[PDB]
Every structure is written in C-alpha cells, then in structure tokens.
Structure 1
Amino acid sequence: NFRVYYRDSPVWKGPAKLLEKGEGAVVIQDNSDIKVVPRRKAKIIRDYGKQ
C-alpha cells in the first residue's frame, strides 16, 4: 500500500518496502538491505490513484 523514498548521507533513492514507522525514524528494506532512516529524510507515499 505504501512505498518509502529516502536520501542517504543527495539523489532520492527508492522505492523501498516500508517495514515500520516510528516517532523519529522509519525502517525500510531497499532491495535486500534493511535501513533505518530519519523521518526528515524519508517520504512515505501511499498509492492514491489506485485506492
């Protein structure tokens, strides 16, 4: 339902699987790697045109 786009360290990377959303960070899986990204550096985008 959701997809997460994020920046490490400038170019936006993604889409990545959303595993968990916290108060100050989000846990995602981009390909085969699990990453912990701060909220300010991640965009969680819902598929709105579908549903």
Structure 2
Amino acid sequence: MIQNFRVYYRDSRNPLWKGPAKLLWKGEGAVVIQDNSDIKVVPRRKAKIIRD
C-alpha cells in the first residue's frame, strides 16, 4: 500500500517534529521508520506520515 512516504515524528523532551524518516511498518498504534541506517519506532499519535 505504501512505497515512499515521508514520516515525521515528535520527541519526548522535543516538541518539534523529526525529519521525514523512511516508512517500514504501519499497523497498531506504533510506526516503524528509518531515519538513515537505524530503524526506530514512534507512536502513531506522535507521528505523521506523508506522500513524497
């Protein structure tokens, strides 16, 4: 369903949103995305997916 969607995520002690990570997984209330070489997971509530 997805290919290249720019996902942005917030931070605990950081209000601003994080760069457009690479979409890897999107199911439950958490989303898995890669910022560069490492894969991170952030709650869907604190994340925002977008289309390139």
Structure ranking higher in strand proportion: 1
Shift of 1:14: 0.9
* Deviant stretches of 4+, over 3 Å: none
Number of residue pairs matched by the alignment:
47
TM-score normalised per structure 1: 0.80
What is the alpha-carbon distance in structure 1 between the residues aligned to residue 27 and residue 42 of structure 2? Answer: 10
Instruction: Compare CA radii of gyration and give the structure with the larger one.
Output: 1
* % identity of equivalent residues: 96
What is the alpha-carbon distance in structure 1 between the residues aligned to residue 43 and residue 10 of structure 2? Answer: 10
